[PDB]
């Protein structure tokens, strides 16, 4: 998963 | 939110392109992966590159692995696309895009740019 | 991972009710996305993972697990003529070949 975890 | 694509043109076969994609600073750039979805003229959607958030990793797509770099730098807000070794294949819109909903993988794009026009003639 | 629409164009009539099927490759499980396209813009995202909506005309709607996928609209609306596109992101990103939508009148 290229986003950013939250 | 919103995504500018730049640096498009005609250029020979062989010469380079550095395409850069800026994003409104009302959206999170840090917070997303990166990517770049071209479309020839005639044809349609091809999936081209991407680039985390951090810059940490990237994937490029064989059509165009080994002859395209990637490129973001979080501050100043601004993704770079560098092309090498341009050849005919190469012409098309180039649209960067971004899939801004979390989940275990993400890939939808909600958001894209208006795109950039590459075309390599001679 | 390779993806293929069924049908590429199709004709209808506004009211119609018209389904697109998407086929993968492999087994992307339910990471789907259905696109449409006018010639004029970027695409705008309709519906992802297969079923969510988010595409805000209720009369779209999206099926399928594994390999089988479709997108089928409610009642045709004349504002519809486009090419739509399938995308699956369980492995990397990739895009179907799309279909084009004709309108009847």
């Known amino acids: 998963n290229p986003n950013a975890n939250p | 939110e919103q995504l500018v694509e730049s640096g498009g043109g005609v250029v020979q076969p062989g010469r380079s392109l550095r395409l850069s994609c800026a994003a409104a600073s009302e959206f999170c750039f840090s917070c997303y992966g990166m990517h770049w979805v071209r479309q020839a003229p005639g044809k349609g959607l091809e999936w081209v590159a991407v680039?985390?958030?951090?810059?940490?990793?990237?994937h490029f797509a064989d059509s165009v692995k080994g002859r395209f770099t990637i490129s973001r730098d979080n501050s100043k807000n601004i993704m770079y696309l560098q092309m090498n070794s341009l050849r005919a294949e190469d012409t098309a819109v180039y649209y960067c895009a971004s899939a801004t909903r979390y989940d275990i993988l993400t890939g939808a794009f909600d958001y894209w740019g208006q795109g950039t026009l590459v075309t390599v003639v001679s | 991972i390779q993806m293929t629409q069924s049908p590429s164009t199709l004709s209808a009539s506004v009211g119609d009710r018209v389904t697109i099927t998407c086929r993968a490759s492999?087994?992307?499980?339910?990471?789907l996305a259905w696109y449409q396209q006018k010639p004029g813009k970027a695409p705008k995202l309709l519906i992802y993972k297969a079923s969510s909506l988010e595409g805000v005309p209720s009369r779209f709607s999206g099926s399928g697990s594994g390999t089988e996928f479709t997108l089928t609209i409610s009642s045709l609306q004349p504002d519809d003529f486009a090419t739509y596109y399938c995308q699956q992101y369980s492995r990397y990103w990739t895009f179907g070949q799309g279909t084009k939508v004709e309108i009847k009148r």
């Open positions: 680039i985390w958030h951090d810059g940490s990793n990237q």
């Open positions: 492999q087994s992307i499980s339910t990471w």
